A paper describes a structure:
Recent discoveries have established that mutations in EPAS1, the gene encoding hypoxia-inducible factor ([name])-2α transcription factor, are causative of familial and sporadic instances of polycythemia, as well as various neuroendocrine tumors. EPAS1 mutations have been shown, regardless of associated phenotype, to result in an increase in [name]-2α stability, by disrupting negative regulation via prolyl hydroxylase domain containing enzyme (PHD) and/or von Hippel-Lindau protein ([name]) affinity to [name]-2α2,10. [name] acts as the substrate-conferring component of an E3 ubiquitin ligase ([name]/elongin BC/Cullin-2) and its interaction with [name]-2α is required for the rapid polyubiquitylation and proteasomal degradation of [name]-2α under normoxic conditions. The interaction of [name] with [name]-2α requires the hydroxylation of one of two conserved proline residues within the oxygen dependent degradation (ODD) domain of [name]-2α11. The hydroxylation of proline is catalyzed by PHDs and requires iron, ascorbate, α-ketoglutarate (αKG), and molecular oxygen as co-factors and co-substrates, thus allowing PHDs to function as oxygen-sensors.
Co-crystal structure of hydroxylated [name]-2α peptide encompassing residues 523–541, which cover over 90% of bona fide disease-causing EPAS1 mutations identified to date, bound to VBC complex revealed that class 1 mutations affect residues contacting [name] while the vast majority of reported class 2 mutations are localized to a non-contacting kink region (residues 535–538). Clear electron density was observed for residues 527–540 of the hydroxylated [name]-2α peptide. The [name]-2α peptide binds to [name] as an extended strand with N-terminal (residues 527–534) and C-terminal (residues 539–540) [name] contact sites. The hydroxylated P531 (Hyp531) is almost completely buried in a highly complementary [name] pocket composed of residues W88, Y98, I109, S111, Y112, H115, and W117. The [name]-2α Hyp531 hydroxyl is coordinated by two H-bonds to the sidechain of [name] S111 and H115, and a third H-bond is formed between the Hyp531 carbonyl oxygen atom and the sidechain of [name] Y98. The carbonyl oxygen of [name]-2α E527 hydrogen bonds to the side chain of both [name] N67 and [name] R69. Furthermore, two hydrogen bonds are formed between the mainchain amide nitrogen and carbonyl oxygen atoms of [name]-2α Y532 and [name] H110. Residues 535–538 form a kink that does not interact with [name]. The insertion of Gly537, seen in [name]-2α, results in an increased sinusoidal nature of the [name]-2α peptide but that only results in local conformational changes.
Residue numbers in the entry:
A (entry chain C): 17 to 49, 57 to 112
B (entry chain H): 527 to 540
C (entry chain B): 1 to 106
D (entry chain V): 59 to 209
Write the structure that this text describes.
């Protein structure tokens, strides 16, 4: 039902499992026949935003609402881009 | 003859 | 609507949603399923304001307009001790590096 | 040899209201009778505007400054139909849910001039991603391909 994602600085992020599967990388890891995943290269200021993206994606995919912009501050954009590329979402 | 779309000038874009 | 939250204690952050009409106590039940501490062993906070069990989240100041999926609202969490007091303590996230020159107005 | 994606010259007027429900400046793009995209006056965020279009004309919508893809009534293309009992037809223009990667590319593109993309310390593959800017022409080719597969 939930998975725990660990950032490089030791912050723990608990998200719903379905949300975590937004990451193609996490989905491939957990796709086989409480779960913990360690990202020692992704800092907490990036990994928190990635989790917000999981929420945003699940909420607004297949929605008729007006969709708000996903905000990315300039100073995190490059690292978030690396993370998104690594995580495939 | 062809008829393309247009915006009426008096249309108060709300 | 739904409010989207981050429940944070120390270096732990829980991402979840709940209805504006659901109560603080119902939110402690959600935490209970994840962190195994029962609601009479949790305190939840909005900033430094302790939230009462009987209040709805909307009544505590959380609104769907501000607690959004892409910018969730923070709920502070503290835990039990049968003879001492655990202060609310949320460890900040890391700080990003300097913007690269090529990314600054030129 | 007329493109699959093109307006038909119906000459049958259709009153439409473009409603920008996005945070972007919207560029409406009309596909003319040869399938060639034509720009029309842009819409600031949160504004709407009355348009005299025609039955079976085709429209798509982009961020005016970047050409990032936008959706209209939740899809790629908008086709006016005949107005029923005077009521105009609404084109509700929204953001799609971009992937996190594409959204990061938008932000990096807005901050960095193309001559400097390759002066960023990121994996080599991301340079070509950054350079692969959104493009109406490539979108039409992809949509045509997709449509033919439905047949």
């Amino acid at each position: 039902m939930y998975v725990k994602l660990i950032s490089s600085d030791g912050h723990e992020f608990i998200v719903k499992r379905e949300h975590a599967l937004t990451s193609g990388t996490i989905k491939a890891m957990l796709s086989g026949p409480t779960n913990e995943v360690n990202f020692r290269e992704i800092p907490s200021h990036v990994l928190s935003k990635v989790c917000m993206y999981f929420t945003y994606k699940v909420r607004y995919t297949n929605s008729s609402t007006e969709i708000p912009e996903f905000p990315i501050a300039p100073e995190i954009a490059l690292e978030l881009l690396m993370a998104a590329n690594f995580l495939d979402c | 003859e062809t008829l393309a779309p247009y915006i009426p000038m008096d249309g108060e874009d709300f | 609507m739904d409010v989207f939250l981050m429940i944070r204690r120390h270096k732990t952050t829980i991402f979840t949603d709940a209805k504006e009409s659901s109560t603080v106590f119902e939110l402690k039940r959600i935490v209970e399923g994840i962190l195994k501490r029962p609601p009479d062993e949790q305190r939840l906070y909005k900033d430094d304001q302790l939230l009462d069990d009987g209040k709805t989240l909307g009544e505590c100041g959380f609104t769907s307009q501000t607690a959004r999926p892409q910018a969730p609202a923070t709920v502070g969490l503290a835990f039990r001790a049968d003879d001492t007091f655990e202060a609310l303590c949320i460890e900040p996230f890391s700080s990003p590096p300097e913007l690269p020159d090529v990314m600054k107005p030129q | 040899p007329r493109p699959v994606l093109r307006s038909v010259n119906s000459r049958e007027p259709s009153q439409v209201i473009f409603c920008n429900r996005s945070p972007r400046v919207v560029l409406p793009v009309w596909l003319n009778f040869d399938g060639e995209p034509q720009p029309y006056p842009t819409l600031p965020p949160g504004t709407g505007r009355r348009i005299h279009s025609y039955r079976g004309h085709l429209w798509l919508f982009r961020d005016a400054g970047t050409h990032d893809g936008l959706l209209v009534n939740q899809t790629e293309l908008f086709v006016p139909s005949l107005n029923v009992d005077g009521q105009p037809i609404f084109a509700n223009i929204t953001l799609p849910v971009y992937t996190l990667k594409e959204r990061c590319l938008q932000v990096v593109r807005s901050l960095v001039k193309p001559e400097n993309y390759r002066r960023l310390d990121i994996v080599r593959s991301l340079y070509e991603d950054l350079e692969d800017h959104p493009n109406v022409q490539k979108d039409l080719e992809r949509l045509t391909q997709e449509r033919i597969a439905h047949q």
